[PDB]
Symmetry: C2
Subunit: 356 residues, 2 copies
């Protein structure tokens, strides 16, 4: 691990169904590490921002550094550029993937070990054309997927209720989660949440804008259905604040928000210390990001509500991995191979790139 990182390559991809930024690091010894940043322009930041963060601001910080100084590198990285937690997460992933390759260890082994070999998978239901999702749900049920998360709030309230009712009638096999993606306005939050809570989903995710800690805390006191914070919490700092103000019953943890795998674990551990639950959320990512999140969760017993790394299997027309992101009988398979467990395909990276 005394080896020096000698190169940094980047790709700004546009995947048919979704833009992401892929990073590759190369050590003196020839080993390579991959990492993905999956920005959501309106929430975490743009792909351009993360591309620049890596290409111009973090590059000088990483090139020439020893693979083993990851802790120092990530500490400096957080301060070297503002935001771009997706880019920071990509760097951490590549650093870990690289160290894992060098030492011949899976990433979870560099995160403390593993506590689970599989992770329950959840697929989101967010199509404005519900008939298309019904067909999707038929397939999900057939594939053994047992969890689904209804994206709510993007249309009228009636549209949300309609779907919950049909799901309960024709797809009772699934456990159902709900996610508003900060979608509701102040004047409609309470009545819409209270109505949806009647359906008793496993949890309702972030009904209002991230900065609405007061309102989130109030919504939490309205029903016994768990209220999960997502956009309101990125890292440990926000988690401490969220816990203090009692804005949620649990949190959706994403490496793209925490800016790294360790910071993601810290969020989960702080949530647990406050008696709050944790879920493996994700952004609109590809298989590389899925693998990074999978290794993180495999080493974090505190995240018990499953994960939602469903895009590579049900959203993207084609993924960027050389080998399919492994999911069997509705469960994500924790890889045990070196590094992340799969390489990104250069040809696909070259083909789908809009910039590199």
């Amino acid at each position: 691990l005394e080896q020096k990182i000698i190169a940094m390559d980047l790709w700004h991809l546009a995947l048919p169904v979704c833009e992401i930024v892929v990073l590759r690091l190369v050590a003196e010894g020839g080993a390579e590490g991959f990492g993905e940043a999956s920005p959501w322009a309106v929430f975490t930041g743009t792909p351009e921002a993360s591309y620049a963060a890596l290409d111009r601001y973090l590059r000088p910080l990483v090139i020439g550094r020893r693979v083993g100084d990851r802790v120092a590198i990530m500490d400096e990285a957080a301060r070297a550029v503002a935001h771009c937690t997706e880019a920071k997460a990509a760097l951490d992933s590549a650093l870990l993937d690289l160290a894992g390759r060098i030492s011949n260890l899976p990433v979870w082994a560099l995160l403390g070990g593993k506590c689970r070999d599989t992770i329950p998978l959840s697929c989101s239901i967010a199509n404005p054309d519900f008939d298309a999702d019904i067909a999707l749900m038929e397939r999900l049920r057939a594939d053994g997927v047992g969890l689904i998360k209804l994206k709510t709030g993007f249309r009228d309230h009636a549209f949300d209720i309609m779907r919950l009712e049909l799901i309960a009638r024709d797809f009772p096999e699934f456990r159902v989660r709900v996610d508003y993606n900060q979608g509701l306005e102040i004047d409609e939050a309470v009545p819409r949440v209270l109505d949806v809570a009647q359906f008793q989903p496993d949890f309702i995710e972030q009904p209002v804008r991230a900065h609405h800690f007061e309102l989130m805390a109030r919504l939490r006191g309205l029903t016994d259905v768990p209220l999960l914070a997502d956009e309101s919490v990125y890292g440990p700092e926000d988690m401490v604040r969220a816990a203090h103000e009692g804005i949620c019953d649990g949190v959706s943890i994403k490496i793209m928000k925490s800016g790294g795998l360790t910071r993601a674990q810290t969020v989960a551990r702080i949530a647990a210390a406050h008696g709050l639950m944790a879920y493996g959320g994700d952004m609109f990512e590809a298989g590389l990001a899925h693998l990074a999140g999978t290794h993180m969760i495999a080493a974090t017993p505190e995240i018990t509500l499953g994960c939602e790394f469903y895009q590579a299997s049900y959203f993207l027309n084609e993924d960027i991995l050389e080998t399919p992101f492994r999911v069997e009988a509705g469960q994500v398979i924790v890889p045990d191979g070196p590094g992340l467990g799969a390489r990104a395909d250069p040809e696909k990276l070259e083909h789908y790139a809009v910039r590199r």
Copy 2:
């Protein structure tokens, strides 16, 4: 790391100057892992309690497990036996040491990498015969040690003041820290702490009993000298409570309290999130425990006040490692070799054992 742990050997040692419990784990392939539990009877527990914890209660959940399932093993261990955080730290150390030997990596490499190659060392000054400490301080200054921590409260207040004045006069080269070890009673806490604070030590450690959160918080508001919590904080759970009640400005982190290296890091990270400083404390341990503590601090940027792994160098007549715990120019050296960086001497373990 898929291979199983097939054996657990224990030694309750009595080291001339100190009792500790040493643990050795053996994997199917023959690799070994060593860990140390350094119990303090009146604070953390007895060596007999920790010996029993490992020998009878943790043995069953460890034997037959995959080396790589460390996270799950430790999660289960914490609940398998009450207290005995020292035994838990020893098990975590052995598991990490074992995994390091297998993968040929330094323990810090399994804790996320490193951010520092050396750690400033502090030696405690606690001899009731102060002339003996003056001699030691002469030795300390010559060896390049620039930090010392005065053990206060075990005698009258005059004795503490006497030593603080002589140190400032004859040994100005040292940065001075103070530690009461919960030694002060309620009716004498304010006056004594105020007097000592006039000497502006770097920090004053745990003036009163661990359970006195309210009193600790009041003491914190009396001076601008940092008040460190030690016995009041063992793990993440205590750190969350201590931060909420504002009982300190910083915390002394010890693996023997946190019951593991990761838990110790979580304590440091939580403190930092609350704007509280962190110090690398220790119990009356030997070189094996010092190495575990060194690797954890090596991977934890949040711990910036140095460490006190001085016993192997200045307290124990003889250490148990095959090679000296490295300290150069008053700085602890972070090992880069496989595992903890040194091996326990089978012959010494047998010689100093009072039970095995």
